[PDB]
From a paper:
Phycobilisomes (PBS) are antenna megacomplexes that transfer energy to photosystems II and I in thylakoids. Here we show the cryo-EM structure at a global resolution of 2.9 Å of the 5.9-MDa PBS from Anthocerotibacter panamensis (hereafter A. panamensis), a recently discovered Gloeobacterial species that diverged from Gloeobacter spp. around 1.4 billion years ago. The A. panamensis PBS features a configuration comprising two herein characterized linkers and presents a paddle-shaped morphology. The two-fold symmetric PBS contains twelve APC hexamers assembled as a heptacylindrical core surrounded by twelve PC hexamers, with approximate dimensions of 273 Å (width), 500 Å (height), and 129 Å (thickness).
In addition, a chain-core linker CpcN (LHC) was found connecting five PC hexamers into the top two PC chains. Phylogenetically, CpcN is distantly related to CpcC but is close to CpcJ. The attachment of CpcD to each pfam00427 domain of CpcN likely inhibits the formation of rod cylinders because CpcD acts as a rod-capping linker that terminates rod elongation in hemidiscoidal PBS. Therefore, the Rt4/Rt4’ and Rt5/Rt5’ were omitted in the reconstructed PBS structure. In contrast, the staggered-packed PC chains only exhibit a preferable inner-chain EET pathway with a longer bilin distance from Rt2’ to Rt1’ (37.0 Å), compared to 24.3 Å in a rod. In contrast, the two pairs of transition dipole moments exhibit relatively parallel orientations in the PC rod, as indicated by the value of κ2 being close to 1. This finding suggests that the efficiency of EET between donor and acceptor bilins in the PC chain is lower compared to PC rods, even when accounting for both the distances and orientations between them.
Numbering used by the authors:
A (entry chain m): 10 to 78
B (entry chain a), H (entry chain c), I (entry chain d): 2 to 163
C (entry chain h), F (entry chain g), G (entry chain i), J (entry chain k): 1 to 172
D (entry chain 5): 592 to 641
E (entry chain 5): 740 to 748
K (entry chain b): 1 to 163
Write the structure that this text describes.
């Protein structure tokens, strides 16, 4: 985090894809329904768990942008 | 789409290590299962219309009280596309036989079941007795192991409807 | 996230009919060939350390500019990420190979990795050629017939090559 | 755990960013736990199993 | 103490 | 997420000067008319499941293709999603009615619903036609003055009509 | 998230040569001026609240509209956010002065603030006026040599001026 | 590369407040500790090539089996890699001395060490012995505060290796 | 409380790692700055009564109206409480200088002071004026390092009050 | 959590009076020798892998009942937990040495470790023996004076030995 | 708390709040049918343990000659006894994982925390890697049919873990 390699936070735009919604229905609505598209800001170190978890959830990454560098 | 290899892939990709012996052996067992299940599906598709119609008259017989004018299916069109729905469920049973897993059932029919039944005032017990007639006939048609997976899949479907 | 059998099932659904007799024959044959591809992917998992070691050694031998100061593989963490990308990408390729459907490969990070590397500034052509190294090393390791009986593997090799080509195209 | 937090101890920047909503409540909980007061109340006087 | 009893049976 | 009072106070603060008597008079007159609109909303809530059932029956009546294989409502859970969407859109109509303002509908759902149903590719004209179905059935039950005093709800009927029309225009 | 020594080390690493004795001399010159620089940072820090209060009072003095209806600070919450935003901006400028670098100031505070004010519609001109008044009061309190040894701090004043100017430019 | 200043300001940013006695004191103490570390960095810069060669021969000396043909260490390009790697290590040690913190070494090499080392079958003992030579030569190079800084940073790199 | 050595121990606990040269440098500088801080503690301790009385009368000078009947200041018990509070504050400032940090002061006055302020209507500006007088008074009681560090401690306290 | 300075301030608050000049002189003397204590704890930390290696080797040479199946440290995971247990014991002893007070070691390792090991079935006397062996290795490693100025550190040796004594008495 | 196929199935089912569907039954059937070759291999390895361990000792000696000279870690009669004991326990746990039809025994017993053991005892994995290499060389004839590959999978996984 504090490290120069820990910095360079990147923003992520996330779309709750159709496959994501189909998986969500079978798993169950334990979270409130929000509009499929939403934005998010993620540091470098926890950048990985974000798209990993989106991959098990079935969603796909719209794009990636860098806050720093 | 939860065929056994599908959750194999999901479990592998969830954490960092590759496939180890357990799921390789599970896939071996699946490929072993795939043949007798495929003759099961073939023989079942050989007997589509007779089965669906016979189950339809069975549904009438077991519930006579509904069959009165005022029946949800009363009238030729309603019972006809009732038989259509039964054929649809048989379709998805065949699909699960191909997948050797509840993928098709869970994905398509079971999802949203009770909500739709409340929405359209449909008693699942009709469907249940239809699949009971399915048990009755498939006790003869399919034999051996293929019979066993077919019976178990229909049992899972019934428990979903139950 | 659909298997090849699930692919055929979805196709039959969209035609709104049952699966064809020829479809049943092809899928039963694929099930018969399932043992061979299970052995192939088991070797891939077992040969994975050898594959990654050989591919990385070849890459660094024919690309030292990755190792020179400020290089894309210099900080000992950028090259560490390169190694983990190697193992995870060959992991996805093995996933596709055993699956029999490139759709799962495309959906798993193939939709995002291209713009990820565009943002990071990494040249994707190096990634694609490292994927070619994956292909060479993995094919060489799988060619070994030790402690196993001999049989046809040409179709599996062709399918794996197509999967590697798809991965390279998606990356770059 | 029903420990009363002095009003001086709380982080204003984190709650302001949550108020704007750029950070989810999960992120605010992360920032709370990472705050030294969490360790001082919990991590510092207690064993690691506890 | 409660966690201890769950280790064995 | 506003109401008539919120918007009125908003514009009153916008001019900076205090509230003017005429606006207060309109607000008071609405308050006197309030209980009528309240009972209308309550009746809508009570009849909602029947509204959805009948409107779905109609939706199948004029469109059969969705039931047929490949329809966006053909799978069981997809048509279940269709039903709960009918639910939520008429519920938002009820929200607009009880509040009397349009932004509580617009900002809360419509902005994201636009891209939602554009990405989903569902034909929005059929969605608005279904909205018209709910409009008809809801007015059938609302015009029903069963077990309640009779009065002049014509303005409320007009407001409900406008809410259905603007919801359909936004979605289609 | 870096300081000037980190900057020099980053270039030294990316070239991969050793930090020159000339570079060592320059950063040592910074270091021996570091003692004085920390006094400048403490002057920013301890005098921050009165500086902020005076600057905000002046903002209200020249810009009468912002407290009046229709002003960007007319709601109490809005001028409250004005106060806290100026406080955090001065805090980050002090961070820049103590780290002796622009990276520390520009990485987090000056990265998404311009987009926030653009999307929200905040007049960046007023924020720039607030920042330059922050700079003016900061100079007024940094020239205060009370209870501290007198000396020449021209490098510190110039560097803090650069930090304030660059912060205003990033905001603007 | 990390500086005490950097960690102080990162903590201040996390807590979102200004700087009190402790942060200023740490900043000061790092500024007075800056110049002896600078001098130590210069004194290690002057002997860079001699240190590199001495470390190479120390590696060839301590463990007998690193020199023979068929060994991973053996190789002309391999020996060039040895020299270049030792140069990297000690240059980043100088960087850490420059920053007056271990952070430069930490991120630049120490992060991602072990898995990369077994990725190519790299013996940690080799680098440990190279840095032992570094200790031996830098002990006679420096005395005083610069000596303490250099020895502590190289031994921190060793502890990371160990 | 939060002393430099205490927070170093805590953070070393956090990452599950031993201490390194940087934090030992911080402790070093703490040890050397203790001696001027120790002399500051001596000068403040020997002057405590005059400090308290001067601060009380300075607050009275700034706001004599508070002493008027019907207000908080009026009452011999009230004035005694003023003096006792200022003495507590001075003692905690001595503890701050001894501890080389704001730890004891923060924990024992700053934690939960504004609550009592609001409840008991105890204006912070009064203690701010008292601490400003203590600043002016220690400007002559102390010089050099001790004066500067005591000043920064007490103005930290003032900024916390406001 | 509390060190010698914190403990003294705590007693001063308990009596409510200022710190005594005698105790202030004691703290001044403690701070004067603080460089020697820092050297001692540095010698601890560099030799900590060596200390733990020596202690583990000698303990396993004298006790063999654990290396065999059914021993408390027989499996790799169990004995690895054992090793990190001694590691953390030494770490907390070092922390107490930095603090000069045993409050932090009590807070971390000596509040409830005993019943923890009783639940785990761990024999405490083995832990105490390991503590003694680490103490011997540590006094050996700190009584050496490599690369550091020589001086009378018998007070530090006694303090470290006594800290190990309290730790051992706590566990067993 | 071992992880075997049936135990993994039970844990998954308990986690999901459901009973056992078709896939769990098929996996149980596969494990039950594969147990017979695994038991065959376990007995065959049990018969010839002494030859395996002795050959492993001499293979480790011949591969790295720099060891068994005095003055280093490996030299010593107690060291030899420890070599024999370690190789014996290795083959014990390999047989256990063969019988369990899962790597859980090996993982929990040795692979859990092995790396810190090695770095705290200077034991580079390469010696035991060569030991298991000789072990698979010997078992290349010891077993037959399915049992051969059943042993191969678990021993290869153990080697990869050692890597
Ligand atoms: C912060 C204070 C504290 C520490 C450091 C601590 C260490 C500690 N040791 C544990 C178990 C253990 N502790 C040991 C140590 C034994 N091995 C040998 O045989 C000896 C008899 C003895 C060491 C000399 C072992 C082997 C276990 C594992 C128990 C088991 O799996 O059977 C556990 C619980 C389970 C686990 O972590 O795996 C902890 C938390 N506990 C605390 O409350
Ligand atoms: C859970 C079952 C189990 C395993 C797996 C095991 C391995 C093992 N071997 C050990 C020591 C040892 N092991 C060896 C064997 C070595 N000699 C050399 O030829 C080779 C590199 C290698 C064998 C071929 C030696 C020499 C030691 C002594 C290390 C020392 O004390 O310095 C130790 C440390 C315990 C002690 O020092 O008494 C373990 C844990 N022990 C077990 O109870
Ligand atoms: C995706 C899987 C799937 C299911 C679960 C399914 C059942 C189903 N039943 C429906 C209504 C109906 N369902 C039935 C049949 C029921 N009432 C009779 O009494 C029968 C005895 C009994 C059957 C056991 C009838 C008569 C209707 C007509 C009501 C209407 O049109 O709204 C509908 C509404 C649209 C339509 O099919 O015309 C569906 C989708 N169809 C499917 O494609
Ligand atoms: C779902 C699976 C997944 C993938 C595939 C993925 C790619 C990926 N690689 C990254 C960094 C990186 N990746 C590489 C590797 C590339 N550059 C080298 O030259 C090689 C030729 C090449 C190997 C393919 C490098 C060098 C970086 C560092 C870039 C930087 O420091 O900014 C990052 C940024 C965060 C990080 O991992 O450090 C991502 C997201 N992330 C994922 O979660
Ligand atoms: C659980 C994972 C798994 C294992 C452990 C496994 C072993 C295995 N694979 C088999 C089929 C086979 N295995 C191979 C081995 C191939 N021949 C080529 O040379 C390649 C180098 C090599 C790997 C691609 C062959 C040729 C067959 C027979 C092909 C067939 O009949 O389908 C058989 C039956 C052969 C017999 O009993 O006579 C076994 C026991 N198979 C699996 O799916
Ligand atoms: C569910 C409702 C509720 C209850 C029942 C409650 C009791 C309560 N009292 C607490 C501390 C305290 N409570 C008191 C008050 C008592 N001690 C004094 O002697 C007085 C005689 C007396 C008040 C008139 C004090 C002085 C403390 C400070 C002790 C400490 O936290 O260190 C705490 C710890 C909270 C924290 O600081 O994190 C609780 C939970 N708190 C609640 O939110
Ligand atoms: C947050 C507020 C909210 C909105 C804005 C909303 C609309 C909405 N409908 C959705 C899916 C859907 N919407 C429909 C309905 C359409 N397709 C046909 O059946 C009809 C012609 C037509 C309806 C009249 C269908 C079928 C899906 C499922 C698509 C799929 O599963 O692939 C989704 C995707 C997420 C999900 O299914 O849970 C949203 C967000 N629902 C909400 O809770
Ligand atoms: C438990 C919550 C609750 C409800 C829902 C409720 C309904 C309600 N609405 C009322 C006003 C009324 N509300 C209506 C409206 C109705 N007549 C027609 O127009 C429509 C079918 C329908 C509304 C859409 C009318 C006509 C009145 C009587 C107003 C009058 O005196 O002229 C009254 C008082 C009747 C009077 O004093 O004259 C009641 C009790 N009361 C409650 O305590
Ligand atoms: C809609 C939100 C809103 C509110 C609540 C508001 C009231 C308000 N009046 C202010 C100025 C002021 N307000 C007062 C009045 C107070 N001082 C005394 O004279 C009186 C006893 C007392 C009146 C009861 C004064 C004198 C100032 C000038 C402060 C200055 O000297 O700069 C300020 C602070 C700005 C400044 O420092 O000049 C606010 C927030 N304005 C708003 O836009
Ligand atoms: C990433 C680190 C970080 C930054 C950069 C930050 C500043 C920041 N400024 C914002 C907008 C704002 N900025 C201002 C201040 C302006 N408007 C007027 O008061 C003045 C003329 C002028 C100041 C001179 C205001 C009032 C808002 C919010 C507008 C509103 O809510 O209507 C916002 C979004 C809304 C909010 O304040 O909650 C943030 C987060 N906070 C952070 O945690
Ligand atoms: C700047 C960060 C950095 C580090 C830390 C680093 C070490 C390092 N040395 C490598 C290759 C190598 N390194 C060596 C040298 C080792 N064997 C012995 O001779 C020596 C004692 C020792 C070096 C001092 C050898 C022989 C190779 C050949 C590849 C192999 O077989 O592993 C590799 C793999 C790819 C490469 O760089 O060529 C790394 C990561 N390289 C870096 O770019
Ligand atoms: C953390 C404890 C600490 C503090 C607080 C600190 C500040 C500090 N700065 C000093 C010298 C100085 N300080 C300054 C800076 C000041 N003089 C200028 O007139 C400006 C008005 C102002 C800058 C805002 C200058 C110019 C010197 C003399 C230059 C030199 O260092 O030789 C001195 C020595 C004189 C004395 O004993 O008071 C101290 C203590 N040093 C510390 O170790
Ligand atoms: C980064 C942390 C740090 C270290 C490591 C450090 C070493 C260090 N130890 C010193 C003195 C000393 N150091 C020691 C301690 C050692 N001598 C004894 O023989 C023991 C074997 C051993 C401790 C167990 C002693 C006894 C002195 C002499 C006291 C004095 O010079 O005032 C000095 C002062 C040199 C001088 O005054 O000329 C330094 C710089 N300084 C630091 O800021």
């Amino acid at each position: 985090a504090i490290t120069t390699q820990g910095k360079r936070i990147y923003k992520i735009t996330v779309s709750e894809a159709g496959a994501y919604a189909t998986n969500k229905h079978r798993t169950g609505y334990r979270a409130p329904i929000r509009q499929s598209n939403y934005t998010l800001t993620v540091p470098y170190d926890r950048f990985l768990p974000e798209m990993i978890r989106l991959h098990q959830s079935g969603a796909k990454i719209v794009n990636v942008t860098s806050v720093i560098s | 789409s939860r065929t056994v290899i599908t959750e194999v892939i999901a479990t592998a990709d969830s954490q960092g290590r590759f496939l180890n012996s357990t799921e390789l052996q599970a896939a071996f067992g699946r490929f072993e299962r795939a043949v007798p299940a495929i003759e099961a599906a073939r023989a079942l598709t050989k007997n589509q219309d007779a089965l669906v119609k016979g189950a339809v008259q069975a549904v009438f017989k077991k519930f006579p009280y509904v069959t009165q004018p005022g029946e949800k299916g009363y009238g030729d069109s309603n019972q006809a596309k009732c038989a259509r729905d039964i054929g649809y469920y048989l379709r998805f049973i065949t699909y699960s036989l191909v997948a050797s897993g509840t993928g098709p059932l869970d994905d398509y029919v079971i999802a949203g079941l009770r909500e739709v039944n409340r929405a359209f005032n449909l008693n699942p017990l009709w469907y249940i007795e239809a699949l009971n007639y399915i048990k009755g006939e498939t006790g003869k048609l399919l034999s051996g192991q293929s019979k066993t997976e077919a019976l178990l899949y229909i049992d899972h479907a019934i428990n979903a409807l139950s | 996230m659909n298997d090849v059998f699930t692919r055929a099932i979805a196709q039959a659904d969209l035609k709104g009919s049952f699966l064809l007799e020829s479809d049943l024959d092809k899928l039963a044959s694929f099930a018969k060939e399932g043992v061979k591809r299970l052995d192939a992917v088991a070797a891939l998992t077992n040969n994975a350390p050898a594959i990654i070691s050989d591919a990385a050694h070849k890459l660094f031998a024919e690309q030292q500019e990755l190792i020179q100061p400020g290089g894309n593989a210099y900080p000992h963490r950028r090259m560490a990420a390169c190694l983990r990308d190697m193992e995870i990408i060959l992991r996805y390729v093995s996933y596709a190979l055993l699956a029999g459907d490139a759709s799962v490969l495309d959906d798993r990070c193939l939709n995002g990795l291209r713009e990820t590397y565009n943002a990071l500034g990494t040249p994707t052509q190096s990634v694609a050629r490292a994927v070619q190294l994956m292909k060479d090393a993995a094919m060489v390791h799988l060619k070994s017939t030790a402690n196993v009986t001999v049989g046809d593997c040409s179709s599996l090799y062709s399918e794996a090559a197509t999967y590697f080509d798809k991965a390279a195209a998606s990356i770059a | 755990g029903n420990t009363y937090v002095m009003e001086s101890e709380r982080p204003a920047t984190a709650e302001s960013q949550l108020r704007d909503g750029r950070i989810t409540v999960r992120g605010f909980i992360r920032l709370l736990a990472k705050s030294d007061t969490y360790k001082a109340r919990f991590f510092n006087p207690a064993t690691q199993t506890r | 103490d409660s966690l201890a009893r769950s280790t064995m049976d």
